Amino acid sequence: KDKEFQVLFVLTILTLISGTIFYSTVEGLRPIDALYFSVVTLTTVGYGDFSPQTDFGKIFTILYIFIGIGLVFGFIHKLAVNVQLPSILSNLVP
Amino acid sequence: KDKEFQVLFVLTILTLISGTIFYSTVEGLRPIDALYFSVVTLTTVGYGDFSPQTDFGKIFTILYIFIGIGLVFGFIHKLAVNVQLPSILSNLVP
Amino acid sequence: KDKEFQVLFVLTILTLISGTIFYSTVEGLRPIDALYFSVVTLTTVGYGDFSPQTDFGKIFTILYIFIGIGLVFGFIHKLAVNVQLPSILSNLVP
Amino acid sequence: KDKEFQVLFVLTILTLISGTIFYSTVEGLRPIDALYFSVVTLTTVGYGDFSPQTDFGKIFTILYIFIGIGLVFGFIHKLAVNVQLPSILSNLVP
Ligand code: NA
Ligand code: NA
Ligand code: NA
Ligand code: NA
Ligand SMILES: [Tl+]
Ligand SMILES: [Tl+]
Ligand SMILES: [Tl+]
Ligand SMILES: [Tl+]
């Protein structure tokens, strides 16, 4: 379960890096904005302060969402249970 | 489980096609924009760069969301477990 | 399980009616817009074409979200499994 | 299970307080707006009527989302099952 969290962590970083490069290049976003936008998209927050304006970007975003949402939320879940859960019990133990 | 993924795949395409035709026609979106908007709606990202402006479109969107979200996320889940999960183990096997 | 879907259905309608009255009155939205906005909020789509502008509306929305999201998605889930799932098998049976 | 709901409740308040202070200070939002924005972010509604404009705010939001979404939805879930579920059965009992 310690290995679980480490595999999900790597795959999320790779997914986020892919988005940062694509949106920086094709949509012209500053890299920090491209990373921020990729995160806001794949967690489904979707503020819309940034959104793709090219047809290439729209098509990429469709696939990016379908491929990436399941991995990011897996990671959030494992981060929730296998890392954030115990530490709270640890601060409780009398 | 191989058949699971294929049924969910077909139903998602049909749902997305329905949205593309409706929003292209009633809301006047280019078909690519209508497909992109349908995806962004049913994954709950909801950037809001497009949104329905007619009352017909608003009513359709209410039903579209309730009917379609469960199918799309089912598919994302099965895509997550029955397709994207193994391949990662497959790249790990020593 | 037939009764499950009927209880969730009633509670969702009541939740949506509550939102429609509140946002129509305090935020001044047309009733159709208030219902549409309530749905878009509680499914977490959140286009932002409408959003609360008064402090009362912002506070109500915080509570509305926390109280209402769990019920709406329960209903979507049961609609997914106890109504939309079988009919697809029913169209498949050879 | 009564204790479950009380631990999740405290942690959600702490998470929301952290966001309110940060966005009030660094992004200049009125405290009520900062709390409202923190809630809309961590439930993934994401209207985008407010969104971070500084690079510090964008970076904080990335971490805030990853850390906070799992806790908020845990709480919503337990609020759904261990508090909102029974009371409805209680109003049904013949
Ligand atoms: Na940058
Ligand atoms: Na097109
Ligand atoms: Na109306
Ligand atoms: Na305030
Ligand atoms: Tl969402
Ligand atoms: Tl959104
Ligand atoms: Tl959203
Ligand atoms: Tl938005």
Kindly list the protein residues that place their beta carbon closer than 5 angstroms to ligand 7, a single-atom ion: A 46; B 46; C 46; D 46
CB C15 within 8 A of CB C68: yes
- Which residue of chain D is at minimal alpha-carbon distance from A32? D55
Residue D81, Cβ neighbours under 10 Å: how many? Answer: 15
> Which tokens sit at C85?
């799932």
The single residue listed with the structure tokens 């949205």 is: B19
Q: What tokens appear for C40 in the block?
A: 């878009």
Contact C70 D49 (CB under 8 A): no
**Amino acid, single-letter form, for residue A12:** T
Q: d(Cα D34, Cα D18) in Å, to the nearest integer?
A: 10
Contacts with B33 (C-beta within 8 Å, 6 or more apart), sequence order: A58, B23, B50
Q: What is the dihedral of CA A75, A77, A82, A85, to 10 degrees?
A: 140
Longest dimension (CA), chain C: 58
If you write DSSP's letter for every residue of chain A in order, what string do you get?
-HHHHHHHHHHHHHHHHHHHHHHHHHS---HHHHHHHHHHHHTT----SS---SHHHHHHHHHHHHHHHHHHHHHHHHHHHTTHHHHHHHHH--
Rounded distance from Cα D64 to ligand 4 centre (Å):
21
**Contact assignment for C48 to A44 by CB distance below 8 Å:** no
Structural domains in chain B (count) = 1
How far, in Å, CA of C83 to CA of C91, rounded? 13
Distance of residue B40 Cα from the nearest chain D Cα, in angstroms? 13
In 3D space, the residue among B19, B14, B30 whose CA is nearest the CA of residue B60 turns out to be B19
Cα-Cα-Cα-Cα torsion C53, C59, C61, C64, nearest 10 degrees, comes to -160
DSSP-based three-state secondary structure for D50: coil
Cβ density class A13-43: b for 16+ within 10 Å, e for less: eebbeebbebbbeebebeeebbbbbbbbbbb
Give the minimum alpha-carbon distance from D94 to chain A in angstroms, rounded to a whole number.
39
Cα–chain center distance at A17:
9
Nearest to B69 among C35, C43, C46 (CB): C43
For residue B10, which amino acid is it? V
CA gap D31, D24 in Å, rounded: 5
What's the CATH code of the domain at B30?
1.10.287.70
Exposure b/e, B51-72, CB count within 10 A at least 16 = b: bbeeeebbebbbebbbbbbbbb
Of the CA atoms within 13 Å of residue B23, those in its CB half-sphere come to 26
B43/A65 CB distance under 8 A: yes
Q: What are the tokens at D19?
A: 């966001």
Cβ partners under 8 Å of residue A67, min gap 6:
A15, B79, B84
User: What DSSP character marks residue D27?
Assistant: S
Which residues in A lie closer than 8 A to residue C48 (C-beta atoms)?
A: 47-48
Question: Residues in chain D, how many?
Answer: 94
Among residues A36, A14, B88, which one has the least CA distance to residue D66? A36
- Domain membership of residue A11 as a residue range: 1-92
Report d(CA C62, CA D45) in Å as an integer: 11
Query: Measured on CA atoms in the order B75, B81, B86, B88, is the torsion positive or negative?
Result: positive
Identify the residue among C59, C65, C71, C73 best suited for mutation to test binding to D, counting D beta carbons within 10 A and taking the highest: C65
D interface residues, C as partner, C-beta within 8 Å: 32-33, 35-36, 39-40, 43-49, 76-77, 79-80, 84, 88, 92
Which residue blocks in B27-83 are alpha helix, DSSP H?
A: 31-42, 55-81
Rounded Cα distance between D32 and B71, Å, is 37
